[PDB]
Amino acid sequence: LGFLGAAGSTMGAASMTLTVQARNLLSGIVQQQSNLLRAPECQQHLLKDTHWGIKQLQARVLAVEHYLRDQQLLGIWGCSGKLICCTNVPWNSSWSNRNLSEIWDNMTWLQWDKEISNYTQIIYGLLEESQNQQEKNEQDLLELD
């Protein structure tokens, strides 16, 4: 489907393009810079026009910070090596009481994100605590071997 070609597809269908969007931020950053570095008087403009040059550095530093933010959250939750991760936190009917068959068949990710937007912060906090407890349990199991 291509980048975001799955945006209107159902949540289920969209799982097959996770690699397309996930890789886009850094391959995007790098390809844009590779074209800038061809220097058709760009290296000269980039460095001479210091106002413009810092606007570009500002954009790139910010893009990197967002990449890292999300990767760190996945790290804290024990999810960093995968695009799809299960956890040890049960789903709350108070976040959404919609049927599972509706979520993965009759609705898109944009719609879903709006539906549970106000629970993002709590879900993330629960994931962080659960993962820390699990890592401690594993360390203790090794001590007991």
């Binding site: 975001l4 799955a6 886009n24 800038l36 500002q58 699990q134």
Partner: protein, 442 residues
């Protein structure tokens, strides 16, 4: 019993504003937008995606009116200042073969300017347009900018001619383009594609008519923030186009003097042939058909048993009351009263619009700066397209049905707002959760 599952690479959007970068296919735009465009532009059509667009809140317009300003200021920075030429001028009228209308329009001024050495001055004779010279109190005069700002000469070889400009999202962002031919600038659009770079936009600057823009695909479209509020402008996009022929008929012998150490000043010098008025030519029939199309579309918002009248500007500074236009580097101020003098109710025969020329421009409306547009040798002719209008509803709660519109405009953002209306900047945030039947092993 459902479990939380985390997904990364999720196709989810949030509205955002970012520092879009420019790309383009001794011009300033070409120098600045050094980054090449896609050799093969691509778009991804998004099936089953409905998004709201809001032309009036489009932050792409605000960024365009921030970088265009910067580009002009940087381009004029490494140039000759003409502050040594803010001196008392001794002026008489130009009486050489003057047609009517032009009598008193040009003045023959002389002054003592600096030269290569600080110990010598040079007497210079140059013609000036009346708009640039004011009396101090034959008579003593000063340049119009002498009591408010430093004057800088634009560099004579630098081209400010608009070229197509493409705005591109930085990585992590995407631009959503609305393909709905009926889109009025505000609300949901159901035919949306994702692009990396926008359609090229020409950074044309004008005040009453919108020149060299895009055309509406099917019909004339009336776009506004509100209908009722007479404090808001109406941006009218035409589907067909009206050709306008702008000419400055006078011939010129441009001369130069060193003002300082490698610093050259250019001046009008004399004029060849008769002294004649600059004019802009609009075909009458084409204009009447175009205006009639606009009127019918206005009826859709005001009623179709109404009277629609057009009138000229109510008054104010030249930069607003006339139609400002950049022709070959020369600055035109065209009188449009001949286009808007009409009432509509339920050989070629062209319209000739007189036009003034001004060399000292308070460009972008900054009180502290002014630029001097050097004169151009020879006769100047431009042919350009009227692609839209900026109208102001005059208002008044008369309930007479005689709605009146004027070529007000005067804003600088409106010119791009009418072109960038199809685009929105969206931030991609590919991380989220959903319930599943899978629990991780623990």
């Amino acid at each position: 019993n459902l479990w939380v599952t985390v997904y990364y690479g999720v196709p989810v959007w949030k509205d955002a504003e970012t520092t879009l970068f420019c790309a383009s296919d001794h011009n300033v735009w070409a120098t600045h937008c050094c980054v090449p465009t896609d050799p093969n532009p691509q778009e991804i059509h998004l099936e089953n995606v409905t998004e709201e667009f809001n032309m009036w809140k489009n932050n792409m317009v605000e960024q365009m009116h921030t970088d265009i300003i910067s580009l002009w200021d940087q381009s004029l920075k490494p140039c000759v200042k003409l502050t040594p030429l803010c001196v008392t001028l001794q002026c008489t009228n130009v009486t050489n073969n003057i047609t009517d209308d032009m009598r008193g329009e040009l003045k023959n001024c002389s002054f003592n300017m600096t030269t290569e050495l600080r110990d010598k001055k040079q007497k210079v004779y140059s013609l000036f347009y009346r708009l640039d010279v004011v009396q101090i109190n034959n008579k003593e005069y000063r340049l119009i900018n002498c009591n408010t700002s430093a004057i800088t000469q634009a560099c004579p070889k630098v081209s400010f001619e608009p070229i197509p400009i493409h705005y591109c999202a930085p990585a992590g962002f995407a631009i959503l383009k609305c393909k709905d031919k009926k889109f009025n600038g505000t609300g949901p659009c159901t035919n949306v594609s994702t692009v990396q770079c926008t359609h090229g936009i020409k950074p044309v600057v004008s005040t009453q008519l919108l020149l060299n823009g895009s055309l509406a695909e099917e019909e004339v479209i009336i776009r506004s923030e509100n209908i009722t509020n007479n404090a808001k402008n109406i941006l009218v996009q035409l589907n067909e186009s009206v050709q306008i022929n702008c000419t400055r008929p006078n011939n010129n012998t441009v001369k130069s003097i060193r003002i300082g150490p490698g610093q050259w000043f250019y001046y009008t010098g004399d004029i060849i042939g008769d002294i004649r008025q600059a004019h802009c030519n609009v075909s009458k029939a084409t204009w009447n058909e175009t205006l009639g199309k606009v009127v019918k579309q206005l009826r859709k918002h005001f009623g179709n048993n109404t009277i629609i009248r057009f009138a000229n500007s109510s008054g104010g500074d030249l930069e607003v009351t006339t139609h400002s236009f950049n022709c070959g580097g020369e600055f035109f101020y065209c009188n449009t009263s001949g286009l808007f003098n009409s009432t509509w109710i339920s050989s070629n025969d062209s319209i000739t619009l007189p036009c003034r020329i001004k060399q000292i421009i308070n460009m972008w409306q900054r009180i502290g700066q002014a630029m001097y547009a050097p004169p151009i040798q020879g006769v100047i002719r431009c042919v350009s397209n009227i692609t839209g209008l900026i109208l102001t509803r005059d208002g008044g709660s008369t309930n007479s049905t005689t709605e009146t519109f004027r070529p007000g405009g005067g804003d600088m953002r409106d010119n791009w707002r009418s072109e960038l209306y199809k685009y929105k900047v969206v931030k991609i945030e590919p991380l989220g959760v959903a319930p599943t039947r899978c629990k991780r092993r623990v």
